[PDB]
Amino acid sequence: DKISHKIDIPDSAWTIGIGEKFKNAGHPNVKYPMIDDSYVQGAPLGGFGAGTIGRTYNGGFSRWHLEIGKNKYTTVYANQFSVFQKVEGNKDGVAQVLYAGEPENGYLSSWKWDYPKESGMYYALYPNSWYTYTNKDLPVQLAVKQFSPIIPYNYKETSYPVAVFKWTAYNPTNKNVDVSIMFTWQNMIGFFGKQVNVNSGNFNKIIKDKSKDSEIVAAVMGNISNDNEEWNGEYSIGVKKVPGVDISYKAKFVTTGDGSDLWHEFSKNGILDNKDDETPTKQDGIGSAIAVNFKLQPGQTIEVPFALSWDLPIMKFGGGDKWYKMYTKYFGKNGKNSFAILKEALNNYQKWEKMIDDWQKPILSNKSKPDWYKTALFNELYYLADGGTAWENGKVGEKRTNNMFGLLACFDYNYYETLDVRFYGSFPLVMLWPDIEKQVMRQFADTINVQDSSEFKVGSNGAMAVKKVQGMIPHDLGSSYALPWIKINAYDWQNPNIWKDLNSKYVLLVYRDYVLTGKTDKEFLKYTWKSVKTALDKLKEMDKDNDGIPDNEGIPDQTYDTWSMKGTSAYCGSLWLAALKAAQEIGKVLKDNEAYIKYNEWYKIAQQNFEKELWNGEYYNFDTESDHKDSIMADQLAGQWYADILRLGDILPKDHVQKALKKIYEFNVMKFENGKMGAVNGMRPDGIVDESDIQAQEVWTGVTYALASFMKYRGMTEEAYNTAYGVYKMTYDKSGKGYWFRTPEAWTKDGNYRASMYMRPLSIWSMEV
Numbered sequence: 178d179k180i181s182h183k184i185d186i187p188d189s190a191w192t193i194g195i196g197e198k199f200k201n202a203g204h205p206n207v208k209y210p211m212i213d214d215s216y217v218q219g220a221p222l223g224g225f226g227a228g229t230i231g232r233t234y235n236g237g238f239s240r241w242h243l244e245i246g247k248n249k250y251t252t253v254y255a256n257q258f259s260v261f262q263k264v265e266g267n268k269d270g271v272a273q274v275l276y277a278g279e280p281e282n283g284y285l286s287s288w289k290w291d292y293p294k295e296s297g298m299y300y301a302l303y304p305n306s307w308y309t310y311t312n313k314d315l316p317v318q319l320a321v322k323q324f325s326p327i328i329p330y331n332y333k334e335t336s337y338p339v340a341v342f343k344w345t346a347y348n349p350t351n352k353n354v355d356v357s358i359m360f361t362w363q364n365m366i367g368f369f370g371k372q373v374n375v376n377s378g379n380f381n382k383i384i385k386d387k388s389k390d391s392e393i394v395a396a397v398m399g400n401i402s403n404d405n406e407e408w409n410g411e412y413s414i415g416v417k418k419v420p421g422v423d424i425s426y427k428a429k430f431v432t433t434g435d436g437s438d439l440w441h442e443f444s445k446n447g448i449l450d451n452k453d454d455e456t457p458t459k460q461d462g463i464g465s466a467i468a469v470n471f472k473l474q475p476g477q478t479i480e481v482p483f484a485l486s487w488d489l490p491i492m493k494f495g496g497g498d499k500w501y502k503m504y505t506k507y508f509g510k511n512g513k514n515s516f517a518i519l520k521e522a523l524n525n526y527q528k529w530e531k532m533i534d535d536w537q538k539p540i541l542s543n544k545s546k547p548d549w550y551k552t553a554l555f556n557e558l559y560y561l562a563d564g565g566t567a568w569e570n571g572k573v574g575e576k577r578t579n580n581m582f583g584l585l586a587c588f589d590y591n592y593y594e595t596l597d598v599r600f601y602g603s604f605p606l607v608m609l610w611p612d613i614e615k616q617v618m619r620q621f622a623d624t625i626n627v628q629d630s631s632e633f634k635v636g637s638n639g640a641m642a643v644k645k646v647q648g649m650i651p652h653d654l655g656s657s658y659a660l661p662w663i664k665i666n667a668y669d670w671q672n673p674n675i676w677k678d679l680n681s682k683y684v685l686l687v688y689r690d691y692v693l694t695g696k697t698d699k700e701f702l703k704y705t706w707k708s709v710k711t712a713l714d715k716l717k718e719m720d721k722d723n724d725g726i727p728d729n730e731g732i733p734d735q736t737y738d739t740w741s742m743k744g745t746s747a748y749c750g751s752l753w754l755a756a757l758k759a760a761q762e763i764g765k766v767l768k769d770n771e772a773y774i775k776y777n778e779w780y781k782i783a784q785q786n787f788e789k790e791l792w793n794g795e796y797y798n799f800d801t802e803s804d805h806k807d808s809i810m811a812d813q814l815a816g817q818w819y820a821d822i823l824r825l826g827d828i829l830p831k832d833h834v835q836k837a838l839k840k841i842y843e844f845n846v847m848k849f850e851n852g853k854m855g856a857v858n859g860m861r862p863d864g865i866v867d868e869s870d871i872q873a874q875e876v877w878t879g880v881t882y883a884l885a886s887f888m889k890y891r892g893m894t895e896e897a898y899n900t901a902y903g904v905y906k907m908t909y910d911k912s913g914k915g916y917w918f919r920t921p922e923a924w925t926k927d928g929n930y931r932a933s934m935y936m937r938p939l940s941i942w943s944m945e946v
């Protein structure tokens with residue numbers, strides 16, 4: 178490997194060999210169908226709300242999130258980079274697709290597949306990833322840096338449906354070598370959203386932008402229709418001319434053929450026919466190819482940038498609503514703007530790289546923090562783009578000031594903004610994109626007094642329940658299969674209108690968002706204040722025995738939605754205490770004296786009774802009435818964790834908090850698989866995992882990272898990082914279970930998982946508070 182020295186890959190990048198087989202991979206541990214797309218994954222490309230494309234470590238464009246809210250894992254084999262090299266003096270050159278695999282059928286059989294093992298590496302530090310190609314049959318070594326401009330405090334470039342592929346080529350040998358790099362792409366209009374005639378009318382055009390010193394050649398792959406529908410739009414690939422390279426192209430090759438129409442040209446001398454052809458296709462799939470060719474002398478390095486854009490302006494959800502995607506604000510809504518997007522990227526990518534370096538640098542340059550922590554911190558952010566992210570710029574046929582936003586809990590449980598989960602998972606938004614965060618919280622504020630008296634069947638018990646109760650915060654803002662933002666509470670496994678954590682978590686999120694954006698946004702507190710008071714007042718009514726604390730009802734009435742709580746729980750009780758203290762402080766800020774007094778009174782009574790009911794001398798009991806009420810719960814003091822972040826002080830005695838955290842580390846971490854897999858949710862006082870429910874026997878990745886932040890704040894530095902390390906190890910390490918770029922909700926002791934591609938582990942960002 179002589180190419181790594183010519184590029185700048187951070188030491189904390191996650192790494193794997195191109196073509197590497199992984200032997201230890203985990204699988205779903207449930208009986209019902211659950212997504213398992215394998216360990217062949219990579220860091221995604223594409224902005225927030227743009228739809229994303231997962232290009233894997235083997236080189237294939239395979240994990241398709243272009244249909245917003247959906248996950249489709251299938252390799253589109255025409256989409257590749259390929260290389261040609263010929264040493265000066267030799268008769269023939271060699272050509273190779275940079276993909277460690279081959280197609281299933283005979284399409285593209287003429288191409289040179291099966292990029293060999295031990296001939297290159299993949300690296301990822303989101304939003305960047307890299308491939309290096311160090312092949313004994315390729316004398317010129319190549320590397321590519323690929324990224325989308327995902328930039329904190331930037332809501333413009335961060336939305337773009339674009340990727341840049343910055344190539345570096347170096348000749349370490351003593352002979353001149355002719356080199357070509359070719360980008361191929363299938364015209365994917367009709368890949369989704371089209372029931373019949375899926376390729377019909379697709380056509381490719383070549384754009385030559387010859388502005389002085391900024392020459393770009395691109396293919397625009399669209400459809401002759403000017404219809405404005407979810408399926409229609411354009412894809413573009415292209416390249417910027419640099420000194421010493423020539424550009425060639427082929428407008429149209431057939432993807433549902435042997436591919437020799439293209440490959441016979443490329444494999445000969447790395448130069449394409451430059452044949453423009455706008456003839457639309459009928460049944461055949463078609464694609465385009467953009468290539469560069471150059472001669473590298475001994476010791477010479479050259480850099481050349483390619484790009485990919487996709488202008489698919491409309492997202493449709495299963496309930497029938499069509500919305501424009503956020504980036505349409507910047508490029509238009511007609512779906513004929515892919516070149517404009519591509520051109521912006523090709524002309525500004527160096528600026529974007531610097532903007533990304535500028536935001537990563539404070540963390541990467543901190544030599545007190547281990548590399549592994551940096552690996553997890555940055556790579557967990559993949560989910561902000563890859564979580565079915567929806568960000569609207571108007572309903573089709575509709576103008577509002579704000580742009581509604583939603584991130585999925587996951588794909589298996591296809592619910593937008595699940596509030597009990599976002600309590601953990603929204604840290605990156607408040608810390609890095611706070612205008613999005615506050616918009617999402619205003620969305621929740623607006624739902625507080627919505628009433629929907631129509632009934633739904635509760636999955637867990639078959640009982641009928643009211644969809645949405647006035648004064649109760651919703652579980653979620655809908656499903657991509659139905660009507661995001663419009664029909665809330667798509668979740669039906671339990672009835673969230675009786676949950677004991679949602680209303681408290683809502684208040685805690687509101688106050689968090691004020692505190693972590695500098696305690697200046699009084700406007701945000703004013704907007705949400707009525708909903709905060711309502712939320713707490715309603716939850717107070719669920720106190721059955723006048724101890725001042727809502728009563729869990731002997732069912733799963735909170736985020737651990739198969740794990741029953743009864744009476745006063747440590748989890749919901751501590752959240753309640755903290756929410757009361759937050760509301761007191763908001764009351765002070767807004768000069769609502771009567772609110773301050775009321776919530777202070779409730780707080781004092783509840784605090785006294787919580788301590789008396791649950792403090793056992795070593796930790797806080799799980800709850801007051803369950804069969805295993807004395808279980809040690811990893812999340813028992815979630816309210817105090819948030820109180821630390823919100824700077825609300827002690828809600829429970831410091832001595833008791835420290836004892837509880839030490840107990841959790843000693844038991845839930847260190848007695849669970851030697852502390853190498855995170856914190857198991859429930860452990861019995863005898864050091865055996867609690868078997869009352871499956872969720873007690875799971876490590877929750879987002880709970881464990883949040884617990885690590887709690888330990889860190891409380892000075893338990895070694896414990897914090899050791900606790901988090903197990904989650905990193907399972908996700909990323911060779912000894913783990915192969916969950917990179919699909920971190921799950923949970924795993925059991927065998928390492929098998931539930932719900933890959935999950936929002937909650939974004940809570941790792943709570944470690945940066």
Ligand SMILES: OC[C@H]1O[C@@H](O[C@H]2[C@H](O)[C@@H](O)[C@H](O)O[C@@H]2CO)[C@H](O)[C@@H](O)[C@@H]1O
Pocket residue numbers: 209590636669670738739
């Ligand atoms: O629906 C989300 C919810 O699913 C729970 O799993 C259920 C599943 O929905 C149901 O179809 C199947 O028959 O039973 C399982 C429970 O065993 C899951 O446990 C929840 O955590 C999740 O929120």
Ligand SMILES: [Ca+2]
Pocket residue numbers: 719720721722723724725726727728744745
């Ligand atoms: Ca009570």
